[PDB]
Amino acid sequence: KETAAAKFERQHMDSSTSPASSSNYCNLMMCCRNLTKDRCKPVNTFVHESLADVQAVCSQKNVACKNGQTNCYQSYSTMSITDCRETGSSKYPNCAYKTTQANKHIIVACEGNPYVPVHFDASV
Amino acid sequence: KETAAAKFERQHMDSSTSSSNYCNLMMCCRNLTKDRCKPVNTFVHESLADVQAVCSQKNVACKNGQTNCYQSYSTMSITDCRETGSSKYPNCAYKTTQANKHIIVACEGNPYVPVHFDASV
Numbered sequence: 001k002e003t004a005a006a007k008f009e010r011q012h013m014d015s016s017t018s019p020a021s022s023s024n025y026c027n028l029m030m031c032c033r034n035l036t037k038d039r040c041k042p043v044n045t046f047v048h049e050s051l052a053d054v055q056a057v058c059s060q061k062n063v064a065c066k067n068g069q070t071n072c073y074q075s076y077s078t079m080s081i082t083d084c085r086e087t088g089s090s091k092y093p094n095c096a097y098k099t100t101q102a103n104k105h106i107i108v109a110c111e112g113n114p115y116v117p118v119h120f121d122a123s124v
Numbered sequence: 125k126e127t128a129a130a131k132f133e134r135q136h137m138d139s140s141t142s143s144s145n146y147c148n149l150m151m152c153c154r155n156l157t158k159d160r161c162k163p164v165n166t167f168v169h170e171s172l173a174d175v176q177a178v179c180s181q182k183n184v185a186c187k188n189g190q191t192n193c194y195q196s197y198s199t200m201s202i203t204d205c206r207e208t209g210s211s212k213y214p215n216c217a218y219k220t221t222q223a224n225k226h227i228i229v230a231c232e233g234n235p236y237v238p239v240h241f242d243a244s245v
């Protein structure tokens with residue numbers, strides 16, 4: 001007869017394999033989004049909030065951009081994001097990244113009509 | 125030529141709300157849809173040793189009052205499964221949501237191991 005402990009393992013345990021682990025999220029996404037095609041992009045950030053919530057940032061807190069322009073905006077609240085940073089052994093075309101999930105305000109630059117995000121400037 | 129807005133979406137967006145068929149398949153493979161659709165379930169993605177170790181972490185009260193519940197000191201990778209509105213046995217359908225949260229389990233036995241999933245917080 002199935003033991004209570006085995007029933008809990010059947011109902012609730014599914015330990016991730018290494019390829020399916022979140023630690024490998026960046027390696028997969030940086031490749032699938034074509035950010036490693038010509039060389040390894042050093043750092044990148046993915047935002048997991050809805051597109052509506054990210055586009056809304058263009059009407060939130062105006063802050064200075066790192067480059068000096070004034071079309072940057074910081075979200076009023078933190079957002080779910082994943083930060084990808086190239087590992088020391090990374091070497092194009094075998095790009096390799098460390099993945100870090102976090103909750104931070106984002107800063108993007110906006111442009112256009114409609115005024116929407118066109119550059120990701122920072123997380124904070 | 126890809127627009128600037130499109131390039132931003134491709135480089136930076138990965139919106140979590142609309143493993144999409146993960147729950148559909150895991151619920152059926154673990155026999156949780158055999159006679160009826162189980163309405164909700166949670167799967168934990170840490171190692172079995174790390175989950176069993178929770179039985180000696182923070183002792184807390186279970187939702188029903190039992191004193192044998194334990195909360196993980198650290199958050200854990202889990203997936204929550206919830207039946208959608210279209211779901212209907214024998215065509216059970218689930219929404220899959222990934223999270224990183226502390227888990228609470230009730231433990232019993234010798235060795236003292238989890239026997240019930242009580243909550244995630």
Ligand SMILES: OC[C@H]1O[C@H](O[C@H]2O[C@H](CO)[C@@H](O)[C@H](O)[C@H]2O)[C@H](O)[C@@H](O)[C@@H]1O
Binds near residue numbers: 166204205241243
């Ligand atoms: O089975 C996974 C779910 O476990 C908990 O929810 C169940 O157990 C609770 C305590 O007995 C009940 O109150 C609840 O109605 C059950 O569905 C947990 O709270 C859920 O988050 C898990 O998905």
